RNA sequence: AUAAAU
């Protein structure tokens, strides 16, 4: 059931629906209407009285939202924060120095410009500069957010990244584990960080994820990893 | 009566100092330059001389402002619709209507549109808003309100496009003027819902702005009529 | 141990502050008068000449 | 009080 922009909505006006990506609430007419093209996903809880929705659509330009995991690059340093850009040609984001474990006004973090960081967006307003924090409260006692070292970063459309982070039925992480050991950071801003013990394995992972990003096939991806890790052998 | 009522630019009005004889005592009239006048130097026959000269085409008005008596007269020239008003410039203590251009975390920069006069009437500064020739000003986060000066959420106070009535504490640098909305009569005056996308909103509470049209309520810093 | 001295010191300190305040009012007034002297110095005779 | 306002 594909949904297009300007599409009629079945739900009644009196009963509210929680906002989801793709769904837009008009500030003027107060009507709730879809603005993106894709599959509508709705979750209903309880016998009656509450609802939630969003649209899974193909987009690649990230827009910061509360509680979104993103991988950013710190281009430059200001007085009290880092300037980090999640994406190219995109507005800069404000990362606080005090947004680190064991922070102090006397000792600034040792992060240098060009370092990769795993971060979550705390406050994101449409008309204000967005802000991220190294540690996210929601995940647990320890965020696991620290600047990445070495590895390789991969560009990926927002849909592919969201499926890789929230969907456990996505075979990509499984088919890569069947070939080599690897650690992976996943950003909702369409960035994927991959690192192995050897470069040839990281490179092989890069090439697979890229093709998987291109291919978008469950059947292809299992084979894709096969021919990729094979091709590295001969290339060696 | 001695000085011409109306003077064109470059017309001599009155010398530097003046005096008269009344009640058996010399009264000293001190002539001081004003808006429309300029004290310059003229020399005749090798003799130096300073006299008040009008610089604007207007009727001329004098007004007194402050043993042996003592006096002070203010000489000025007033022109006499289109209004220019250049003499008017943001100075410490004046009230100024501004519009929010951008929002940051620790401050909020705007641009100066009009300036409140003195006894309401205003002086509109005409400039191009699509160039940047318009005077820019910055409202600090500590100058938002007297209540809790330390922690102030700028997102819940102002908004891009909202009109803010403020008072300039100081000139600052060439880039930003200093603006405070600490008092009651200062704050967001005119604003619309959703950054101007929705309908008009009016000021009810000092920290709450509502819209009696769509029933929308947004958190702003409102002033008092 | 030197708290008695400190109490004495505060009393010693206090007297000086008081002396300064009385003096200050006088100083402001003179300025218009200073402006007067220049007019006095200039000859009345010239003014009729110019 | 072990290195402060790119």
UniProtKB/Swiss-Prot annotation, chain A:
Keyword Cytoplasm in annotation: yes
Annotated GO CC locations: cytoplasmic exosome (RNase complex); exosome (RNase complex); nuclear exosome (RNase complex); nucleolus; nucleus
Q: Which UniProt keywords apply?
A: Cytoplasm, Exosome, Nucleus, RNA-binding, rRNA processing
Q: What is its main location?
A: cytoplasm
Q: What is one GO biological process annotated to this record?
A: RNA catabolic process
Q: Which Pfam families match?
A: KH_6 (PF15985), Rrp40_N (PF18311), RRP40_S1 (PF21262)
Q: According to its UniProt record, where is this protein located? A: Cytoplasm; Nucleus, Nucleolus
Task: Tell me the ranges covered by the S1 motif domain, including all copies.
Answer: 65-135
The record's annotation in SUPFAM superfamilies points to:
Eukaryotic type KH-domain (KH-domain type I) (SSF54791), Nucleic acid-binding proteins (SSF50249)
For whether the record's keyword set contains Zinc, the answer is: no
Query: What GO molecular function terms would the record report?
Result: manganese ion binding; RNA binding
Role, per record:
Non-catalytic component of the RNA exosome complex which has 3'->5' exoribonuclease activity and participates in a multitude of cellular RNA processing and degradation events. In the nucleus, the RNA exosome complex is involved in proper maturation of stable RNA species such as rRNA, snRNA and snoRNA, in the elimination of RNA processing by-products and non-coding 'pervasive' transcripts, such as antisense RNA species and cryptic unstable transcripts (CUTs), and of mRNAs with processing defects, thereby limiting or excluding their export to the cytoplasm.
What more does the record tell us?
Answer: Present with 6050 molecules/cell in log phase SD medium.
The family line of this record is:
Belongs to the RRP40 family.
Quaternary structure?
Answer: Component of the RNA exosome complex. Specifically part of the catalytically inactive RNA exosome core complex (Exo-9) which may associate with the catalytic subunits RRP6 and DIS3 in cytoplasmic- and nuclear-specific RNA exosome complex forms. Exo-9 is formed by a hexameric base ring of RNase PH domain-containing subunits and a cap ring consisting of CSL4, RRP4 and RRP40.
- What protein name is recorded for this chain? Exosome complex component RRP40
Which species? Saccharomyces cerevisiae (strain ATCC 204508 / S288c) (Baker's yeast)
State which gene encodes it.
RRP40
UniProtKB/Swiss-Prot annotation, chain B:
InterPro entries reported for this sequence: Csl4, CSL4_N, EXOSC1_C, NA-bd_OB-fold
Q: Which GO terms describe its cellular component?
A: cytoplasm; cytoplasmic exosome (RNase complex); exosome (RNase complex); nuclear exosome (RNase complex); nucleolus; nucleus
GO MF term list: RNA binding
User: What keywords are assigned to this protein?
Assistant: Cytoplasm, Exosome, Nucleus, Phosphoprotein, RNA-binding, rRNA processing
Tell me if Cell cycle is a UniProt keyword of this record. Answer: no
> Superkingdom, according to UniProt?
Eukaryota
SUPFAM superfamilies in UniProt: Nucleic acid-binding proteins
User: Which GO biological process categories is it annotated with?
Assistant: exonucleolytic trimming to generate mature 3'-end of 5.8S rRNA from tricistronic rRNA transcript (SSU-rRNA, 5.8S rRNA, LSU-rRNA); mRNA processing; nuclear polyadenylation-dependent rRNA catabolic process; nuclear-transcribed mRNA catabolic process; nuclear-transcribed mRNA catabolic process, non-stop decay; RNA catabolic process; RNA processing; TRAMP-dependent tRNA surveillance pathway
Compartment(s) where it occurs, according to its Swiss-Prot or TrEMBL record? Cytoplasm; Nucleus, Nucleolus
Which family does this protein fall into? Belongs to the CSL4 family.
Summarize the subunit comment: Component of the RNA exosome complex. Specifically part of the catalytically inactive RNA exosome core complex (Exo-9) which may associate with the catalytic subunits RRP6 and DIS3 in cytoplasmic- and nuclear-specific RNA exosome complex forms. Exo-9 is formed by a hexameric base ring of RNase PH domain-containing subunits and a cap ring consisting of CSL4, RRP4 and RRP40.
**What does the function comment of this entry state?**
Non-catalytic component of the RNA exosome complex which has 3'->5' exoribonuclease activity and participates in a multitude of cellular RNA processing and degradation events. In the nucleus, the RNA exosome complex is involved in proper maturation of stable RNA species such as rRNA, snRNA and snoRNA, in the elimination of RNA processing by-products and non-coding 'pervasive' transcripts, such as antisense RNA species and cryptic unstable transcripts (CUTs), and of mRNAs with processing defects, thereby limiting or excluding their export to the cytoplasm.
UniProtKB/Swiss-Prot annotation, chain C:
Q: Tell me where in or outside the cell this protein is found.
A: Nucleus, Nucleolus; Nucleus
Q: Phosphothreonine modification sites?
A: 25
* Record note on disruption phenotype: Deletion mutant is temperature-sensitive. Impaired growth at 37 degrees Celsius. Impaired growth at all temperatures, nonviable at 37 degrees Celsius. Mutant is defective in the 3' processing of the 5.8S rRNA and accumulates a discrete species, 5.8S + 30, that is 3' extended by 30 nucleotides. Accumulates 7S RNA. Accumulates 5' external transcribed spacer (ETS) RNA. Accumulates extended forms of snR40 small nucleolar RNA (snoRNA). Accumulates U24 + 3 snoRNA. Accumulates poly(A)+ snoRNAs.
Signal peptide region = none
Q: What else is known?
A: Present with 2160 molecules/cell in log phase SD medium.
Q: What is the protein's known function?
A: Nuclear-specific catalytic component of the RNA exosome complex which has 3'->5' exoribonuclease activity and participates in a multitude of cellular RNA processing and degradation events. In the nucleus, the RNA exosome complex is involved in proper maturation of stable RNA species such as rRNA, snRNA and snoRNA, in the elimination of RNA processing by-products and non-coding 'pervasive' transcripts, such as antisense RNA species and cryptic unstable transcripts (CUTs), and of mRNAs with processing defects, thereby limiting or excluding their export to the cytoplasm.
Family classification:
Belongs to the exosome component 10/RRP6 family.
Name listed for the protein in its UniProt record: Exosome complex exonuclease RRP6
Organism phylogeny: Eukaryota, Fungi, Dikarya, Ascomycota, Saccharomycotina
The range of the complete sequence contained here reads 496 to 545 of 733
